[PDB]
């Protein structure tokens, strides 16, 4: 129940051999803990993707809003890059003028 909590429990189970009071015991325990951990991680990602798919088919204006936001960040990032580059160009023109 509530895949978050299974993720938390499995993550705490990854450390159970260290926090208490040779090789093959460690190996099989590590393999089983890490495999259950990654399996519940993939199930959580699958849940988020299914919910995003249902939103993208039912309420498509939200997707367009996120695209608007990402294109605006692309614009601002491009202008920041060109401004830094332009300041470096003007500094190099002032350097190369002085030979």
């Amino acid at each position: 129940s509530t895949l978050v909590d299974e993720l938390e429990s499995s993550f705490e189970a990854c450390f159970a051999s260290l926090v208490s009071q040779d090789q093959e015991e460690i190996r099989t325990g590590v393999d089983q803990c890490i495999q259950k951990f990654l399996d519940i991680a993939r199930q959580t990602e699958c849940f988020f993707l299914q919910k995003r798919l249902q939103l993208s088919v039912q309420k498509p204006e939200q997707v367009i809003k996120e695209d608007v936001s990402e294109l605006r960040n692309e614009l601002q990032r491009k202008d920041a890059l060109v401004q830094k580059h332009l300041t470096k160009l003007r500094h190099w023109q002032q350097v190369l003028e002085d030979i």
Partner: protein, 122 residues
Amino acid sequence: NTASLCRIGQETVQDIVYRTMEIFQLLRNMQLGTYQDRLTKLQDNLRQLSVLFRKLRLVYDKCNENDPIPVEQLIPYVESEERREIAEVNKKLKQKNQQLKQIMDQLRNLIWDINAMLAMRN
């Protein structure tokens, strides 16, 4: 909104696994002042990971609050002002990308000319 909350929730699970991998690498390297520095890095990583778990439970509850259509009905087998906003920003960064291409071409040509002229001086 919520269809970006799903993206953030995916990114949290992608970050948790990567952060556990970095934790296990820190525990791999720790050899019995840099002792204390590795202690601080370990405790800070564990703090950020607990923050990520709390954020993940928040995002799970938010997306699970806000389904009438079951999946596998959503795949296509064979047999309004926001659109104008999209077209506006698309035209805007079309022009921005073409100007960036001109800047990039002139930088490429200047680098190539510098290397050719300096290669021939020897």
